[PDB]
Design a protein around this ligand. Sequence first.
Ligand SMILES: Nc1ncnc2c1ncn2[C@H]1C[C@H](O)[C@@H](COP(=O)(O)NP(=O)(O)OP(=O)(O)O)O1
Ligand SMILES: [Mg+2]
Ligand SMILES: [Mg+2]
Length: 430
Amino acid sequence: GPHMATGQDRVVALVDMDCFFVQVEQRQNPHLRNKPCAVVQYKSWKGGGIIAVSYEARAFGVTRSMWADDAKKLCPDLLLAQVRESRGKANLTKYREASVEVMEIMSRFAVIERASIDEAYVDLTSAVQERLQKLQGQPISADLLPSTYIEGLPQGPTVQKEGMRKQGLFQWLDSLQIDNLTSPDLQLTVGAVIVEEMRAAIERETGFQCSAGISHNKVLAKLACGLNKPNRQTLVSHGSVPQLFSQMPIRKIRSLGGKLGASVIEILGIEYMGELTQFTESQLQSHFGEKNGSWLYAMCRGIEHDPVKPRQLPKTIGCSKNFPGKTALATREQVQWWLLQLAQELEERLTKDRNDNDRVATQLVVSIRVQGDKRLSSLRRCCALTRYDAHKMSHDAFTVIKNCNTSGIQTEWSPPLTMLFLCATKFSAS
DNA sequence: ATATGACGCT
DNA sequence: AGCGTCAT
Ligand SMILES: Nc1ncnc2c1ncn2[C@H]1C[C@H](O)[C@@H](COP(=O)(O)NP(=O)(O)OP(=O)(O)O)O1
Ligand SMILES: [Mg+2]
Ligand SMILES: [Mg+2]
C-alpha cells in the first residue's frame, strides 16, 4: 500500500510523424497536398510497393505493403510519389534528412531517444520540474492544451469530436491539484503543455504534423500516441490504465506484437492486457522467463522502467536489397555487382556520417538470404571495416560469404540469393 | 514479390 | 560470434 510502486516517477513522451514519407513528398510537391496519396517503392512489379499512405487515401482502404496497382482499384484518384532509386536500389536519403530536421527541433526541448526514422521518445521529467517552479500555483488553462486528449475522459454525468475532446480536458483540468508540485497527474499535464510547444515548433519549422503520447513510461507513451492520430496528442494517466487495458488486445502493447504476445494469449487463455494482473510475478516468470515475467507483471499495471536512452543517432549504418522470385541472384557476377552497388551507397553515407557526427565504423556485417529460407537472414558474417572504400568493402564482403556457394560451376551461384545486406557497426569516436 | 534498425539469447 | 525477435 504505502510502499507500492506505481510507476509515476517519470514523464515520458513518444512523438511520431503523421504519414511521414507522404508529408515529406507533399511538402516538396504542393500538388500532392490534401489528397489521397501514397509513397511507392519501385514500379515494374504491380506498380510498386506502397510504404506510406496519407489519411485521405487510408479512408479508401489503401494500406502499407499494398501494391500500387491494387491500391488504385480501391482509390482511382490516388496520387503517387516514388522513392528515389539510386544504383538500382531504393535510396531513402530524403526521409533520413527530413528525420534529422525533426529530431534536431525535439532535441532543443529535452533528451530524446531516436526510435525509428520518424519517432522519438522524450524524457520530460526535468523540463516538467523546472516549468513547474516557473509556474507556481498558476492554474493550467485549456488554451495551453489545444490538441490534447485526456484518455478515458469525459466520463459520467455533445456529438462532435472536438466537443468530446474539450469536455474531457475540462473535467481533467477541473480535477487537478495545482498546489501539489509532486502530483503525477499535474506533471503529465505540464508534460503535455511542453509537447504542444514541441509539436507547434516542429510544424512551424518543417511544415510536418505529428502525433504524440504523454505518459509515465515508453510503452504507455507509444500506445497513447496512436489513440488519436493524426495531428493530436494524448495523455494517458496512471489512473486511466485499468479501464484502457481492460479491453486492450495484448498484441497492441510494444514488444507483445509477435510470438511472445501470442504465447501469453495461448498459454494463459486471455485476450486483454488487464487480465495479466490476476497472475503472480512468479507464475509469469515460470511461463515466460525471469525477465519477461517481471516485465509483464509490472506492465499490466501500467508500470515499466525501460529508460529513455540519450541517443539521437543510429548505432549502425546499413544498406540492403531483396531480390524476390525470378530476380534472385544466381551468378557470381551478379552477387559481386550488387555488393558493389550496396557498398557504394554505404560509403557515401559512412563518409557523410564521419564528417557529420565525428565517428568511424569499425566492423562490416554481411548478411544474405537464400531462396527457400523464410528467415530475415540465412547467414551473417563480419570482417574488419578499416577503410571507407566501396570496392574494398564489397570485395571483403564477397570474401566472407563466397563459401556459402554450393555450386559446382564457378560462374554460378547456388542457392540463389534473395537478399544482400551490408551493415557498418561498432563505431568509435573520430 | 511484406529497407532498414535495436536488442535478446547463447 | 552468429542467430532470433520485434519493430517502423
Ligand atoms: N515496414 C516498413 N517498410 C518500409 N518502410 C516503412 C515501413 N514502415 C514504415 N516505413 C516508413 C514509411 C513511414 O512513413 C515511416 C514511418 O512509419 P510509421 O510511423 O509506422 N507510419 P507513418 O508515419 O507513415 O504513418 P502514421 O505514423 O501516421 O500511422 O517509416
Ligand atoms: Mg508515423
Ligand atoms: Mg513511427
